[PDB]
Amino acid sequence: RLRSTPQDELHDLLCVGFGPASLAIAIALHDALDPRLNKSAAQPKICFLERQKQFAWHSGMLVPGSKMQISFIKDLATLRDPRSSFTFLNYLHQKGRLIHFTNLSTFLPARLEFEDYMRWCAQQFSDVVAYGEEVVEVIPGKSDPSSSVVDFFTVRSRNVETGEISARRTRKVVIAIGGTAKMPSGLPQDPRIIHSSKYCTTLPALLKDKSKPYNIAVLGSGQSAAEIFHDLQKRYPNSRTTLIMRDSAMRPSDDSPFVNEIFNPERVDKFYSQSAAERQRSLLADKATNYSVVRLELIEEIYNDMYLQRVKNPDETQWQHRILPERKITRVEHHGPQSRMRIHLKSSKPKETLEVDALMVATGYNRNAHERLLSKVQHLRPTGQDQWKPHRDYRVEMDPSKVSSEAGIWLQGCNERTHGLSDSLLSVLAVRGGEMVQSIFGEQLERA
Amino acid sequence: RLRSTPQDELHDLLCVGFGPASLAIAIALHDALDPRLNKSAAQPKICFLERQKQFAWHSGMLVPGSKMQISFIKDLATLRDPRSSFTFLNYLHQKGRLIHFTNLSTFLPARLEFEDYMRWCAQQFSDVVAYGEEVVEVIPGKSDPSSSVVDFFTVRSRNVETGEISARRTRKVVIAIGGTAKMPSGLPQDPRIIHSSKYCTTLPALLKDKSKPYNIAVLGSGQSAAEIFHDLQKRYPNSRTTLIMRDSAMRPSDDSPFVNEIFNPERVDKFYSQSAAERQRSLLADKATNYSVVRLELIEEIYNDMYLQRVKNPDETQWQHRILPERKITRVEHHGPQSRMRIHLKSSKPKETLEVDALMVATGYNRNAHERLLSKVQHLRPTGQDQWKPHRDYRVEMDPSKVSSEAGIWLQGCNERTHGLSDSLLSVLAVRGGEMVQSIFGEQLERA
Amino acid sequence: RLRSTPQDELHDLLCVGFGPASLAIAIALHDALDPRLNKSAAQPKICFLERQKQFAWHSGMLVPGSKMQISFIKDLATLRDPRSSFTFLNYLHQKGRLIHFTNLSTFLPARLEFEDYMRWCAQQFSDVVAYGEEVVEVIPGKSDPSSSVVDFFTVRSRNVETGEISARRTRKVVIAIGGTAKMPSGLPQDPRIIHSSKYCTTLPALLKDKSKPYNIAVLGSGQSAAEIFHDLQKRYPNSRTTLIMRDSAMRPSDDSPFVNEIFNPERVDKFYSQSAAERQRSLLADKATNYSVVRLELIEEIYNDMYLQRVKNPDETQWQHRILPERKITRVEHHGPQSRMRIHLKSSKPKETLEVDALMVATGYNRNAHERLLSKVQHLRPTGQDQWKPHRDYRVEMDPSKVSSEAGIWLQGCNERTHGLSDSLLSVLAVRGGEMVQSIFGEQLERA
Amino acid sequence: RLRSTPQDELHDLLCVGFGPASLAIAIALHDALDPRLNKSAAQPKICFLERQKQFAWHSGMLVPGSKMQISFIKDLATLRDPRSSFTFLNYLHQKGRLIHFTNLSTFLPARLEFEDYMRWCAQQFSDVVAYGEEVVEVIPGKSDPSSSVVDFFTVRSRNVETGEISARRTRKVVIAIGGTAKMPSGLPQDPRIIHSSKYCTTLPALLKDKSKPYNIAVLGSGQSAAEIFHDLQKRYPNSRTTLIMRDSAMRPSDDSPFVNEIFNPERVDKFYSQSAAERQRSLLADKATNYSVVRLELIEEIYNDMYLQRVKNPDETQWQHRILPERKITRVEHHGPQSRMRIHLKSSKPKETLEVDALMVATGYNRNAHERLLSKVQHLRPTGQDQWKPHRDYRVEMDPSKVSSEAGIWLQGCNERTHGLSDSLLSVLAVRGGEMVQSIFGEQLERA
Ligand SMILES: Cc1cc2nc3c(=O)[nH]c(=O)nc-3n(C[C@H](O)[C@H](O)[C@H](O)COP(=O)(O)OP(=O)(O)OC[C@H]3O[C@@H](n4cnc5c(N)ncnc54)[C@H](O)[C@@H]3O)c2cc1C
Ligand SMILES: Cc1cc2nc3c(=O)[nH]c(=O)nc-3n(C[C@H](O)[C@H](O)[C@H](O)COP(=O)(O)OP(=O)(O)OC[C@H]3O[C@@H](n4cnc5c(N)ncnc54)[C@H](O)[C@@H]3O)c2cc1C
Ligand SMILES: Cc1cc2nc3c(=O)[nH]c(=O)nc-3n(C[C@H](O)[C@H](O)[C@H](O)COP(=O)(O)OP(=O)(O)OC[C@H]3O[C@@H](n4cnc5c(N)ncnc54)[C@H](O)[C@@H]3O)c2cc1C
Ligand SMILES: Cc1cc2nc3c(=O)[nH]c(=O)nc-3n(C[C@H](O)[C@H](O)[C@H](O)COP(=O)(O)OP(=O)(O)OC[C@H]3O[C@@H](n4cnc5c(N)ncnc54)[C@H](O)[C@@H]3O)c2cc1C
Ligand SMILES: NCCC[C@H](N)C(=O)O
Ligand SMILES: NCCC[C@H](N)C(=O)O
Ligand SMILES: NCCC[C@H](N)C(=O)O
Ligand SMILES: NCCC[C@H](N)C(=O)O
């Protein structure tokens, strides 16, 4: 069991964010310290800062009926050690549900179930996690101020409820803050225009009456757009929905066994060793495994609904739920006296008008939010560097004549270009957590 | 094209009922008269009497999302002649939907779609079908009244809208009236106790508010009980449902290829030729193909919903939707001042109380309604016979010294004991229709 | 790690057989003694006697391509404790194969793979397992010979290689010897007539040339008969095969979720508590889950091969591989001067002749071989008892005035009538092993 | 029924090739002339020239177990008219196999079965098909030699058995000759290097002994390469096989419903109307539907075999069957005194040596063989044209002042760039055949 470190003490590690990636590190550290699992093994002074009030995993996209797109074996522990108490199967055993899960004959739990698994995991680390704390900046520190050597970092976080800044000092920092909502530059700001990440949380507040005949539009062609589009038909039974996509069709995610091997934990070494050109070419060739793609079973379900509409009415323009392929939004009118916005559409090749009460935007995420937190440490990078360069062990490159060997900053979840498509996913977290514990607490736990 | 016969004329054939079975005969006759399909081929004087106001197929069980449990190839024509204009594939071509159906990659259309196919078929016979006519009795006739030989039949039908009796005379009669709702003898009569056959038609009238937290019970363990039970959770989102069954579990329908061969049109010969003991033993050994069984995909779907309830709440007694296996109803209290009935339950081996607003009873059908229509012709059977004995060609056995060779009565859909499990189904209708046309219009069309 | 007990010492436990059932006990004991898994925990003196020269699992039926009919989660440890080092997933991790297994997206490993898993398990108990030892009898013993109280058992085993009898004394005995080959009484003894259990081991010796056009017959309609029949077509490409069954068709195994719940470890309590009549009726109602049934995917594969034969030749009598349903063997001629036997066939209802080089008999197993080993202890049963009566904890009932409380005999794998259909299977072994350790070593390990 | 035209007579139509594409035209013409199907309808003088001795469909790739990659509904007639006697379902009915096919529950017949269907179709046109005739050139003709107007074409064909040239004159020509084997330019000519199209025909002649331990290599990553690679393991049980591909993995064919709509017969209009840039971009975006892709079920099967090899031996270099991704052939040594060639390999990014008895090359086809047959008619194209420009109705553009309106040349199966990915496939053949009959025999059959 991990014990709390007083705020005023110098930490060994401070992690920013407590989502899956950070939780995987916490679990890996527990396991590395467990004399039952690690026969070799003073507790390291560790703390996790999370802006949410309690543990949650993409709560705004927890659509009813939504399933995991990954095998349960690729949970937070199994691929590193199946004997771990933090496995999904052990979770089910602790819940009295293992025999019942077995009878489902599925590798893909509901997202709701997998979130509770991770919640059950996270709760066992409550003593070392500070919730309601949003990190605003990371600042370099010098134990000897008159020297020119940085040997610690001050991490400042704002309390979400109360608003005051708190400071914690640490030798090492991990940033695992996921991504920020990516919005098209052409779209204007409006409370009726909502990103996919806030679908379950903000949309019901805007459209209070669930029986009212609303017009709701969805922009995108990926898993989130398909999930939202399909869900709206259940959540708002009398609403007219529209899916808008640049591509000609919803295209299936590629989970075929040979292609799927790029997500193997050991393939991170092979991917990282490749040159920039070889890494850029590889990500593009395997784009159908993660980006702008939908699980085949969802596509088929949607297509079936589209076919039943055809049975009832051969006239496509009369359909309650429609898909408009090869379209882009030219302009949005949202200053009119009516409840609805006017969306203007044209061909996406190098058209109609829609009037809608709400526009759901499922255009993915940006993984650049760490830049804002690390502006004050940019000068510690090697001369001329304008991007953070993560090593194989995820430790960012810094000038060794400016930064002590005991001090470092690690990045997690934003290292796709260097580590592969599995970097932002749950695929390698169990193994990566294990690697991270070794990279950070290596020398400290070698003597045991 | 088949033309109408004036009511006052002597018919060659009169069919009672215009459901799938009778429709299959009509289609087979059209095809036998089509010089394009039948190279050998005065039109026979034919009329169909149907009690419904227009063509419908189990409308009270047309659950949204419900699928066919039979391959579309086993439609009303294909197995007899794929070149027929009455095939499901030709229907889709006429509707502009064939390419769209192909992309679904399914042999199992929605029940809604298949009903429209049969509707599209039936509408082409509107000139020879009298809707809104319920047959009340079949009476024997003698062209020479002083003789002791029956050579025609008078069929009397009551108009459902207006109530008056009409009489039509014919040499030959087909009875294809399906089955009547089978209700348990222990259950009392109550408007809150409804048979599965009236689920979509009468239940919404009883429970007007779709958002109200009702308690609704379902009795049975077959396809209809599972379909109703699963549907209620969608149709009444806030209702507490209960499935009550005598058996320990929902058991899957057997559609495995070798076992499924009993439904082959040619296997009717082999089944019919078997003795009474061999026929009784065969039906029991293949009971899992049709009776008290559910499509595996529906069972799995229901089980998944049951599992998600377990994820949210480990306490089974708190669940919104529950299944109570190995239970029987001992008594029903329905005279109380409250809106709900009290259902008392005990073990089905040789318990609780439920309070419900509605009880859905899915206990199948009886195939004995033809007996009431043929009471006045019973004396034409061979001496000592107290059951109607259908030949291989479905023509009931009558005393040849009392009934002329040109006169006869045929039975359809109630001949399971003699013809097999496929008799009540859509399995052999295309071929059976063809056989029926030959049996009835054989000598009349042999000269062509 | 479990250490060896000298032959001459009084044992706490002696297990007869080292198949899955006994291996599950060994694993459960290791786990109960592991202070990492069991926080409470002198080693108990234990020994396993196995007649085979090394660990094997139905080697004569290890057909190439054959799969497990059970989810890998129902391995030898997971359902009791997923943290165990003896889980299938931990096995794959130790073999460097876990990521590769995950990509298969299957719960059903090849029988070859699962056997190696169990081999990998068994090898860790080599110090407490005596291979090449066939138990011939269990004899009661009295530490005080002049008393009338039995407090130990002598177990005598014959060395298979050398032939001499060895004696080991123990307070408690487990008999987990599986089943003996069940052969029809009408069939005569012949080297060309081989039981399914010796298919992979004895048949290749009889039919040495794999390219020779043999006639090979298979008797049965279950999983083993289907597996052998399908395999012969690959193993002997030029041979004429024949499947002979009493039933009209191959019928599928029922693995539907609600019915499958009878295999739950907790349902053993509910099944055991039921009366003899309720237990007899329950086994018969769920017969399609284990007995005379074939995995649907195998049936479909076989049917497809049968269909391709029809494409090439419409004449069924000319087919290389044929299925003869509703047939029984009346007599077998095997004294003729030719290489082939003559099998005479008739209808199985209350016919042809086959000439074959080999007859494979897949008619299941008997679970009564323990009777022969326990004849000398029969007099210790309560007066009038002529069958062994196993308690819930599998300990057979004995007269408490004749047998001390520290002495007992346990049965495993033959308790279907009292414990359910899962008794002979791998379904509950993990949990049953755990229960067995508690029943046997309860008082001995309570002080820890 | 279509009757033969004497060789010396002027034909209305002459078709080059009698594969699926030409067969579809023949069937469409039969149907357009059938007064049963076409209510409006002297027979047109038509002849088909085919170089094979009898009807065959990719005989060199008729791998045992190989399935169709297209739904049977997309046969040679159904999508145009389901009432046609040339439908796959009618074929099965004529063969007595329709009920048996239904029980398979598959849209994908074996390639062997579908070939026999097309054979059964083709045989009904034997009177208008000249087999054993290879067309060597098409020459323009002038009924008035002194004029400057071409109004007919002479088609010259060489008899394959006897070698002499025959000439047939026609107003209109269709070229439906499929594609020629595409071979990499770096590979030298050798009898041990065989294209996929000659796998079933020439490889068994080269490797006579099926039990001999050969080394066999397969170059490619598409359906044919996967099929050959998987088949070799069955056909040569003791051989060491190697799959060589430039890509990192076998990638699955995309048959998802929305993407699959590009293969719709009506989408040919939409595709054709698009500009050259829009057509080039569309083919590339949907490349995963036809090119360098494998049916998912085959990939999974291959992967499973690869996994079983891992179970038996963790050492990948020791495996009997191996896949070498991201490799290209640099040089081939084939002049050595040994039976085997030496294949040198390097990385395909911008290595080992293999010694093999045979190299199977599955690198697709070229669709440019029509160019050689039309060299003498090139001058009839509009000035400056160096490529044949097919109209929507497939009629190539010619100078209207040089070619009469009654004379024309049509292309089939090579029009991908203008008509879409379905052009070379079986997808639109039924409809295209119908369109072709109208384009060619339009004015001739309008008066009926
Ligand atoms: C709808 C949806 C479904 C998905 N399903 C799958 C799937 O099936 N399989 C799969 O492999 N991947 C899936 N993913 C991908 C997903 O990114 C990963 O599963 C996972 O969320 C990665 O975890 P993370 O910790 O890197 O990022 P996150 O899960 O986003 O966690 C980051 C955490 O940091 C916190 N944080 C952010 N900023 C600050 C700050 N300034 N201060 C303090 N804390 C902060 C956030 O509150 C958050 O809790 C899915 C993504 C979405 C959107
Ligand atoms: C919910 C449900 C789903 C089913 N799905 C399938 C399936 O997937 N596949 C399958 O093979 N089978 C299925 N069946 C079985 C079904 O019985 C047959 O498909 C089919 O209905 C048989 O047709 P029929 O004409 O014999 O009987 P019916 O369809 O019942 O037709 C009888 C007709 O006679 C009329 N009639 C009755 N009495 C009189 C009277 N006195 N005078 C005049 N007219 C009268 C009725 O109005 C009715 O129209 C299903 C049954 C149910 C209840
Ligand atoms: C082909 C086949 C496939 C199967 N597949 C499955 C499956 O997928 N899933 C499933 O749940 N079940 C399956 N089973 C059922 C099977 O019975 C169990 O999986 C398992 O074998 C039960 O283990 P056991 O120890 O009870 O019996 P066994 O496995 O038979 O082990 C008994 C052991 O005792 C030894 N022995 C016997 N007599 C003596 C003696 N006199 N002295 C000393 N030693 C002796 C034997 O050599 C043997 O090693 C299958 C059975 C067969 C035949
Ligand atoms: C292994 C394989 C599997 C396939 N499976 C599918 C599938 O599942 N679905 C699908 O849609 N497509 C499939 N195809 C694509 C295939 O191209 C089409 O199915 C089909 O063959 C197209 O017919 P065609 O007439 O255009 O060409 P072809 O089938 O090649 O027919 C051309 C004919 O012209 C003849 N010919 C050639 N030159 C001359 C000459 N000089 N004189 C006279 N005659 C000549 C040839 O002998 C041949 O018979 C497959 C292709 C291959 C190689
Ligand atoms: N969208 C998440 C992709 C998961 C990946 N196919 C994997 O198996 O790891
Ligand atoms: N419930 C209808 C059964 C249909 C049958 N399996 C058939 O294929 O004909
Ligand atoms: N033939 C073995 C049956 C296994 C059983 N269905 C189970 O899941 O335990
Ligand atoms: N490889 C042939 C592709 C067939 C295509 N998916 C179709 O449905 O027409």
Characterise the protein shown here.
The structure is a homotetramer of 448-residue chains. Chain A is of the alpha/beta class. Chain A has one domain (1-448): FAD/NAD(P)-binding domain. Chain A is built from 12 helices and 17 strands. In chain A, the strands form 4 sheets. In chain A, strands 1, 2, 3, 4, 5, 6 and 17 form a 7-stranded mixed sheet that branches. The first copy, chain A, has a 5-stranded parallel sheet with strand order 8-15-9-10-11, with helices on one face. In chain A, helix 1 crosses helix 12 (429-446). The first copy, chain A, starts with 10 loop residues before the first strand and ends with a helix. Chains in contact: A-B, A-C, A-D, B-C, B-D, C-D. Chains A and B meet through helix 4 and helix 9 of A and helix 4 and helix 9 of B. Residues 16-22, 49-52, 57-58, 61, 68-70, 134-135, 176-178, 224, 413, 424-427 of chain B line the site of one flavin-adenine dinucleotide.
Key structural traits:
homotetramer, binds L-ornithine, globular, 17 strands, monooxygenase (chains A, B, C, D), seven-stranded mixed β-sheet, iron ion binding (chains A, B, C, D), FAD/NAD(P)-binding domain
Summary of the model, kept short:
Chain A is built from 12 helices and 17 strands.
Main sheet overview of chain A? 7 strands, mixed
CATH class type of chain A: Alpha Beta
Quote the CATH topology of chain A: FAD/NAD(P)-binding domain
Beta strand % of chain A: 15-25%
The quaternary state of the protein chains shown equals homotetramer
**What number of structural domains do the residues of chain A give?**
1
What small molecules does the structure contain? flavin-adenine dinucleotide, L-ornithine
Report helical residue fraction of chain A: 25-40%
For the largest interface, the chains and their residue counts are:
A-C, 31 and 31 residues
Category from helices, strands and their pairing of chain A: alpha/beta
